Design a protein around this nucleic acid. Structure first.
Ligand SMILES: [Mg+2]
Ligand SMILES: [Mg+2]
Ligand SMILES: [Mg+2]
Ligand SMILES: [Mg+2]
Ligand SMILES: [Mg+2]
Ligand SMILES: [Mg+2]
Ligand SMILES: [Mg+2]
Ligand SMILES: [Mg+2]
Ligand SMILES: [Mg+2]
Ligand SMILES: [Mg+2]
Ligand SMILES: [Mg+2]
Ligand SMILES: [Mg+2]
Ligand SMILES: [Mg+2]
Ligand SMILES: [Mg+2]
Ligand SMILES: [Mg+2]
Ligand SMILES: [Mg+2]
Ligand SMILES: [Mg+2]
Ligand SMILES: [Mg+2]
Lengths: 142, 103, 48, 109, 54, 117
RNA sequence: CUAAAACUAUGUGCCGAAGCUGCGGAUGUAUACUUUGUAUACGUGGUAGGGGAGCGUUCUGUAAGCCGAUGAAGGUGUGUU
RNA sequence: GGGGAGUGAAAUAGAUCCUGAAACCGCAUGCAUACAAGCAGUGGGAGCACCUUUGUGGUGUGACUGCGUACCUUUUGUAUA
């Protein structure tokens, strides 16, 4: 008897929709990352993506605690000599909540081809409606 | 119908007709050996988990024969210190064939 | 038992001469028992 | 059945002849002869010599019609170099290689 | 002024990946059946139904 | 007795270069580079014989954790309960069972649950 | 990361090394004991360096032998110990 | 310069001529490779191709993934820039 790897051809991805209204950002992102990586399945394999699709709706209603809405800084560098840019959590969540969720979740994922493939399965929407009704997602209440 | 058995400091999930390599045994190439310390026997809605051993379960195998695994090269080298050491290795195994699982 | 094929020296009579600088495995390799970087490690290195 | 012609010892480096050899690999011999006729490359002359030699070999020694022959294989290998001296400034000297090449052409039905 | 490492054969070929030649534009002339370079006179001196050096 | 070291040296270099088949560039063609590549492959394989056991145990533990969380447990409490229930199945077999037979793994989780109570 | 993913105190589990244990194999020293083979025990990271045991290469004898055109040496693959 | 024909036991023994290694340079086939960061391997591992077989087989390749800063010398100490 030897230990078997999940074959990529028999991996069954499932669709889920989670509502982010009034949830702690990091404490929701850990569960999202666990679902995207496939860590909740017994066929789990570190070199295979066996995770699920996760739809995040009402992404702009996600919450941070303490004074982080004003104190949490998001940085960028344009790679130009003085081009370090900075924004707020509350400015960026009223402008690009999808970038907030992507930054939170991408840092909790592996960094490489498999990690990019895993991040492709998180679909983030600021409103209450998503366009994936053809995929029939189930309500994952975290 | 599978059973968990112990052989050579290792546990194996076996089914009937399975041919598996375990650590070297003393039994000769026609002997039939018996495992009476079966740990679990599953038959389908009939699951007997021994704590630690299933009471009367027995698994009979046939010694197909002994061999060695393919050659492993062991290389040791300490850089800048003038030390190098090479060794070969082939591990002995016994190849068994599972004949019967009682449970 | 008396042939030029079947004559042997006594056990312990012959030893192999030691050969320096013939690799790591021999144990007398790179410097051949001389150590590193002194007067005694040079050619004709003994003091009187 | 392939018919071969070998132009051994052509006075040109293989790197330059290979550019012409790549142009006609896997083509009809009529198309290849057209391509070689209207090229301004020095290698085109030598490759045309070798290719028309292979076509003549196929017709005479093997009795194959030319209308369906094809450049089924061609490659350029290096040959024996000539070594020469080139004086340089300040008494320095450099070594010049005069590179040759062998062209192999195989035509097939 | 000069390389610090010898370039591998693979990078050398990747540089030469742009070195291929192109064929020319050839047309079959109808007044002679000949093949010539397009918009060029033939080697017999013909071009578009006109003759040089009769 | 002049000894020409041509056949033996060639044989040794050919052995080292045969152990280098598949390596990139000089590492499979040039003896000086191939020899270092081969010695390093050996050191790596020695170290990875040890690392493989850690890697496979961590895989089994992740799979058991997934199976135990599908049954209202966690790896910690399930292993503790199976050790309190005198069950001595090791992690490789437990992970194989979790991956291939969910009913038997639910039965094992029931043993562990009843022992934890 | 904020009734923490911090800190203090306490507890129950678990993970975690080439450590320990299990299984298989080799080897050094010593002791028994056949009288040189097995047990038993303790050991087996190493530079300088010391000690012990071997492989292979050319040449001389063994050899006016033995193998070789039904194919030597050499070269290039494969399988195997 | 070559292809035949012929000679020869042999002509990839054809005069740059016994054997004809490596570096190095072609062509052909199989597989991989144009969203992805580093001593180029190693452990695992899907898929494909070809052999064979009713293999828990072999041969080539290697998506993805954990770990991983050449060798020598000299040094207290070197991935050392
Ligand atoms: Mg020493
Ligand atoms: Mg020195
Ligand atoms: Mg000193
Ligand atoms: Mg000294
Ligand atoms: Mg190439
Ligand atoms: Mg361990
Ligand atoms: Mg130990
Ligand atoms: Mg032992
Ligand atoms: Mg030790
Ligand atoms: Mg030692
Ligand atoms: Mg020959
Ligand atoms: Mg020759
Ligand atoms: Mg791609
Ligand atoms: Mg210094
Ligand atoms: Mg210094
Ligand atoms: Mg260091
Ligand atoms: Mg350096
Ligand atoms: Mg550098």
């Amino acid at each position: 008897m030897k230990t078997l790897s999940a074959k990529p051809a028999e991996v069954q991805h499932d669709w889920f929709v989670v509502d982010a209204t009034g949830k702690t950002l990091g404490r929701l992102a850990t569960e999202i990352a666990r679902r995207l990586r496939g860590k909740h399945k017994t066929s789990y394999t570190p070199h295979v993506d066996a995770g699920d699709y996760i739809i995040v709706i009402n992404a702009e209603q996600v919450q941070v605690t303490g004074n982080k809405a004003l104190d949490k800084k998001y940085y960028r560098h344009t790679e130009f000599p003085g081009g370090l840019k900075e924004t707020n959590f509350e400015k960026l969540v009223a402008h690009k909540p999808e970038e907030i969720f992507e930054r939170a979740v991408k840092g909790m994922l592996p960094k490489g081809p498999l990690g990019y493939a895993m991040i492709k399965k998180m679909k983030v929407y600021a409103g209450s409606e998503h366009p994936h009704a053809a995929q029939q997602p189930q309500v994952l209440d975290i | 119908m599978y059973a968990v058995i112990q052989s050579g400091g290792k546990q194996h999930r076996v089914v009937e007709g399975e041919t598996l390599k375990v650590e070297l045994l003393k039994a000769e190439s026609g002997a039939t050996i018996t495992f009476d310390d079966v740990l679990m026997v599953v038959n389908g809605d009939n699951i007997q988990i021994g704590a630690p051993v299933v009471a009367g379960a027995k698994v009979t195998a046939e010694v197909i024969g002994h061999g060695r695994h393919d050659k492993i090269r062991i290389i040791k080298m300490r850089r800048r210190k003038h030390y190098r050491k090479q060794q070969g290795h082939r591990q002995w195994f016994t190849e068994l064939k599972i004949t019967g699982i009682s449970g | 038992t008396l042939r030029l094929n079947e004559l042997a020296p006594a056990e312990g009579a012959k030893r192999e001469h030691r050969r320096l600088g013939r690799g790591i495995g021999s144990g007398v390799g790179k410097t051949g028992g001389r150590g590193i970087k002194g007067q005694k490690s040079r050619k004709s290195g003994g003091v009187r | 059945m392939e018919v071969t012609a070998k132009l051994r010892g052509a006075a040109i480096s293989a790197q330059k002849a290979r550019l012409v050899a790549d142009l006609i690999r896997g083509k009809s011999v009529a198309h290849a002869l057209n391509i070689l006729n209207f090229s301004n490359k020095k290698a085109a002359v030598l490759v045309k010599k070798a290719l028309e030699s292979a076509i003549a070999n196929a017709e005479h020694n093997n009795s194959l019609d030319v209308d369906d022959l094809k450049v089924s294989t061609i490659y350029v290998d290096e040959g024996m170099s000539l070594k020469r001296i080139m004086p340089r400034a300040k008494g320095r000297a450099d070594r010049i290689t005069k590179r040759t090449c062998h062209i192999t052409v195989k035509v097939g039905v | 002024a000069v390389q610090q490492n010898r370039k591998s054969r693979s990078r050398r070929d990747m540089r030469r990946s742009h070195d291929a030649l192109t064929e020319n534009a050839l047309t079959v002339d109808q007044a002679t059946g000949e093949t010539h370079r397009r918009h060029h006179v033939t080697k017999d001196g013909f071009y578009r139904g006109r003759q040089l050096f009769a | 007795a002049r000894v020409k070291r041509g056949v033996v040296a060639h044989r040794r270099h050919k052995k080292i270069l045969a152990r280098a088949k598949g390596y990139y560039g000089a590492r499979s063609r040039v003896y000086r580079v191939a020899f270092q590549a081969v010695i390093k492959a050996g050191q790596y394989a020695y170290r990875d014989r040890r690392q493989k056991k850690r890697q496979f145990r961590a895989l089994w533990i992740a799979r058991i954790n997934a199976g135990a969380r599908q049954n209202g447990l966690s790896y910690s409490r399930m292993i503790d309960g199976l050790k309190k229930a005198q069950v001595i199945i090791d992690r490789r077999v437990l992970a194989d069972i979790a991956m291939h037979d969910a009913v038997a793994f639910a039965a094992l989780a029931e043993k562990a649950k009843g022992a934890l109570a």
